[PDB]
Amino acid sequence: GHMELFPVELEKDSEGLGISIIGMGAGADMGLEKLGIFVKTVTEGGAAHRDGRIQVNDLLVEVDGTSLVGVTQSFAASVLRNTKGRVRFMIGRERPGEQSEVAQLIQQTLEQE
């Protein structure tokens, strides 16, 4: 499996963006910090919903010129304000996972020799 680090380029309206973020994740390791400021919502009023770029299941891994990795939600909210009107982000979603081994798992139960 992997995180799909795909480039996301939005175009904001005169309104701006139309999303929200949320501070999820656990592991404030102090100098690594495996946190995830994922998209909390993607408001229909804004360009993000109408474009279909930043989706509610996406994660801001890095912005045009600033790596996130796992910051505080305030940091992420602020990076989008420090950046230009159009910036490419690298969204990294953990798309795969439910591929196999779900619920029942593999579980070598029929082999106990």
PDB file of C-alpha atoms in Angstrom:
ATOM      1  CA  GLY A   1       0.000   0.000   0.000  1.00  0.00           C
ATOM      2  CA  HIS A   2       1.038   3.621  -0.183  1.00  0.00           C
ATOM      3  CA  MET A   3      -0.130   7.168   0.192  1.00  0.00           C
ATOM      4  CA  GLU A   4      -0.955   8.681  -3.128  1.00  0.00           C
ATOM      5  CA  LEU A   5       1.023  11.868  -3.188  1.00  0.00           C
ATOM      6  CA  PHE A   6      -0.729  13.479  -6.064  1.00  0.00           C
ATOM      7  CA  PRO A   7      -0.510  17.135  -7.161  1.00  0.00           C
ATOM      8  CA  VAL A   8      -3.587  19.130  -6.446  1.00  0.00           C
ATOM      9  CA  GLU A   9      -4.033  22.520  -7.995  1.00  0.00           C
ATOM     10  CA  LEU A  10      -6.985  24.571  -7.065  1.00  0.00           C
ATOM     11  CA  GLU A  11      -8.202  27.788  -8.333  1.00  0.00           C
ATOM     12  CA  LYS A  12      -9.808  29.890  -5.751  1.00  0.00           C
ATOM     13  CA  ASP A  13     -12.686  32.204  -6.389  1.00  0.00           C
ATOM     14  CA  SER A  14     -12.919  35.827  -5.351  1.00  0.00           C
ATOM     15  CA  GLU A  15     -14.429  34.156  -2.298  1.00  0.00           C
ATOM     16  CA  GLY A  16     -11.359  32.075  -1.850  1.00  0.00           C
ATOM     17  CA  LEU A  17     -11.426  28.442  -0.962  1.00  0.00           C
ATOM     18  CA  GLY A  18     -14.297  26.286   0.188  1.00  0.00           C
ATOM     19  CA  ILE A  19     -12.961  23.654   2.468  1.00  0.00           C
ATOM     20  CA  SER A  20     -11.971  23.112   5.970  1.00  0.00           C
ATOM     21  CA  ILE A  21      -9.314  21.145   7.695  1.00  0.00           C
ATOM     22  CA  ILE A  22      -9.100  19.115  10.835  1.00  0.00           C
ATOM     23  CA  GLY A  23      -6.248  18.196  13.086  1.00  0.00           C
ATOM     24  CA  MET A  24      -6.257  14.446  13.189  1.00  0.00           C
ATOM     25  CA  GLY A  25      -3.512  11.998  13.809  1.00  0.00           C
ATOM     26  CA  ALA A  26      -1.633  10.917  16.814  1.00  0.00           C
ATOM     27  CA  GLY A  27       2.008  10.970  17.514  1.00  0.00           C
ATOM     28  CA  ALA A  28       3.461  14.272  18.468  1.00  0.00           C
ATOM     29  CA  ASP A  29       6.930  12.822  18.362  1.00  0.00           C
ATOM     30  CA  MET A  30       8.651  16.200  18.640  1.00  0.00           C
ATOM     31  CA  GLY A  31      10.497  16.423  15.410  1.00  0.00           C
ATOM     32  CA  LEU A  32       8.588  14.026  13.170  1.00  0.00           C
ATOM     33  CA  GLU A  33       5.036  14.382  14.405  1.00  0.00           C
ATOM     34  CA  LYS A  34       2.816  12.000  12.533  1.00  0.00           C
ATOM     35  CA  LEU A  35      -0.257  14.141  12.406  1.00  0.00           C
ATOM     36  CA  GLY A  36      -2.658  14.625   9.647  1.00  0.00           C
ATOM     37  CA  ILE A  37      -4.359  17.805   8.851  1.00  0.00           C
ATOM     38  CA  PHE A  38      -6.953  16.230   6.649  1.00  0.00           C
ATOM     39  CA  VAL A  39      -9.754  18.009   4.909  1.00  0.00           C
ATOM     40  CA  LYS A  40     -12.664  18.337   7.292  1.00  0.00           C
ATOM     41  CA  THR A  41     -15.146  19.444   4.748  1.00  0.00           C
ATOM     42  CA  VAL A  42     -15.385  20.842   1.322  1.00  0.00           C
ATOM     43  CA  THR A  43     -18.042  23.468   1.122  1.00  0.00           C
ATOM     44  CA  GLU A  44     -20.208  23.548  -2.014  1.00  0.00           C
ATOM     45  CA  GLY A  45     -20.006  27.329  -2.118  1.00  0.00           C
ATOM     46  CA  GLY A  46     -16.336  27.274  -2.839  1.00  0.00           C
ATOM     47  CA  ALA A  47     -14.325  26.306  -5.828  1.00  0.00           C
ATOM     48  CA  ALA A  48     -12.888  23.160  -4.226  1.00  0.00           C
ATOM     49  CA  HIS A  49     -16.234  21.354  -4.245  1.00  0.00           C
ATOM     50  CA  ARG A  50     -17.184  22.490  -7.736  1.00  0.00           C
ATOM     51  CA  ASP A  51     -13.769  21.635  -9.157  1.00  0.00           C
ATOM     52  CA  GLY A  52     -13.287  18.381  -7.297  1.00  0.00           C
ATOM     53  CA  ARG A  53      -9.711  18.880  -6.446  1.00  0.00           C
ATOM     54  CA  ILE A  54      -9.362  19.066  -2.702  1.00  0.00           C
ATOM     55  CA  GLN A  55     -11.776  16.426  -1.522  1.00  0.00           C
ATOM     56  CA  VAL A  56     -12.956  15.624   2.017  1.00  0.00           C
ATOM     57  CA  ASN A  57     -10.743  12.509   2.122  1.00  0.00           C
ATOM     58  CA  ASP A  58      -7.576  14.265   1.104  1.00  0.00           C
ATOM     59  CA  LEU A  59      -4.615  15.389   3.154  1.00  0.00           C
ATOM     60  CA  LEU A  60      -2.298  18.317   2.790  1.00  0.00           C
ATOM     61  CA  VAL A  61       1.083  16.574   2.799  1.00  0.00           C
ATOM     62  CA  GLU A  62       2.856  19.566   1.464  1.00  0.00           C
ATOM     63  CA  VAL A  63       1.896  22.844  -0.128  1.00  0.00           C
ATOM     64  CA  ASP A  64       3.691  24.444  -3.175  1.00  0.00           C
ATOM     65  CA  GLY A  65       6.771  25.277  -1.185  1.00  0.00           C
ATOM     66  CA  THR A  66       6.262  24.097   2.395  1.00  0.00           C
ATOM     67  CA  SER A  67       6.158  20.547   3.640  1.00  0.00           C
ATOM     68  CA  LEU A  68       3.484  19.750   6.171  1.00  0.00           C
ATOM     69  CA  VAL A  69       4.150  16.135   7.202  1.00  0.00           C
ATOM     70  CA  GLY A  70       2.035  16.793  10.275  1.00  0.00           C
ATOM     71  CA  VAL A  71       1.635  20.216  11.715  1.00  0.00           C
ATOM     72  CA  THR A  72      -0.947  21.809  13.916  1.00  0.00           C
ATOM     73  CA  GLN A  73      -4.294  22.675  12.269  1.00  0.00           C
ATOM     74  CA  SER A  74      -3.550  26.368  12.762  1.00  0.00           C
ATOM     75  CA  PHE A  75      -0.282  25.954  10.848  1.00  0.00           C
ATOM     76  CA  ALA A  76      -2.026  24.343   7.900  1.00  0.00           C
ATOM     77  CA  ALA A  77      -4.714  27.046   7.895  1.00  0.00           C
ATOM     78  CA  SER A  78      -1.985  29.628   7.914  1.00  0.00           C
ATOM     79  CA  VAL A  79       0.150  28.044   5.150  1.00  0.00           C
ATOM     80  CA  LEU A  80      -2.713  28.407   2.720  1.00  0.00           C
ATOM     81  CA  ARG A  81      -2.743  32.097   3.597  1.00  0.00           C
ATOM     82  CA  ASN A  82       1.016  32.551   3.192  1.00  0.00           C
ATOM     83  CA  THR A  83       0.927  31.006  -0.207  1.00  0.00           C
ATOM     84  CA  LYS A  84      -0.203  32.571  -3.493  1.00  0.00           C
ATOM     85  CA  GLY A  85      -3.632  32.379  -5.060  1.00  0.00           C
ATOM     86  CA  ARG A  86      -2.750  29.292  -7.018  1.00  0.00           C
ATOM     87  CA  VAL A  87      -0.430  26.722  -5.573  1.00  0.00           C
ATOM     88  CA  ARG A  88      -0.040  23.019  -6.176  1.00  0.00           C
ATOM     89  CA  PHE A  89      -0.255  20.906  -3.137  1.00  0.00           C
ATOM     90  CA  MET A  90       0.717  17.348  -2.743  1.00  0.00           C
ATOM     91  CA  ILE A  91      -2.162  15.547  -1.330  1.00  0.00           C
ATOM     92  CA  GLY A  92      -1.455  12.223   0.109  1.00  0.00           C
ATOM     93  CA  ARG A  93      -4.377  10.090   0.737  1.00  0.00           C
ATOM     94  CA  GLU A  94      -4.321   6.598   1.929  1.00  0.00           C
ATOM     95  CA  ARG A  95      -6.561   5.333  -0.782  1.00  0.00           C
ATOM     96  CA  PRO A  96      -5.696   1.552  -0.695  1.00  0.00           C
ATOM     97  CA  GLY A  97      -6.120  -0.667   2.325  1.00  0.00           C
ATOM     98  CA  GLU A  98      -9.516  -2.285   2.069  1.00  0.00           C
ATOM     99  CA  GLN A  99      -8.007  -4.420  -0.697  1.00  0.00           C
ATOM    100  CA  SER A 100      -7.909  -7.708   1.108  1.00  0.00           C
ATOM    101  CA  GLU A 101      -7.459  -9.156   4.625  1.00  0.00           C
ATOM    102  CA  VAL A 102     -10.421  -7.156   5.885  1.00  0.00           C
ATOM    103  CA  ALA A 103     -12.775  -8.418   8.623  1.00  0.00           C
ATOM    104  CA  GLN A 104     -11.766 -12.067   8.448  1.00  0.00           C
ATOM    105  CA  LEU A 105      -8.114 -11.207   7.778  1.00  0.00           C
ATOM    106  CA  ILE A 106      -5.848 -13.865   6.312  1.00  0.00           C
ATOM    107  CA  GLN A 107      -5.518 -15.871   9.502  1.00  0.00           C
ATOM    108  CA  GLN A 108      -3.842 -19.258   8.937  1.00  0.00           C
ATOM    109  CA  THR A 109      -6.314 -21.075  11.060  1.00  0.00           C
ATOM    110  CA  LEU A 110      -6.572 -24.159   8.865  1.00  0.00           C
ATOM    111  CA  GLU A 111      -2.921 -24.824   9.488  1.00  0.00           C
ATOM    112  CA  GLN A 112      -2.063 -25.629  13.044  1.00  0.00           C
ATOM    113  CA  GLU A 113       0.306 -28.512  12.386  1.00  0.00           C
TER     114      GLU A 113
END
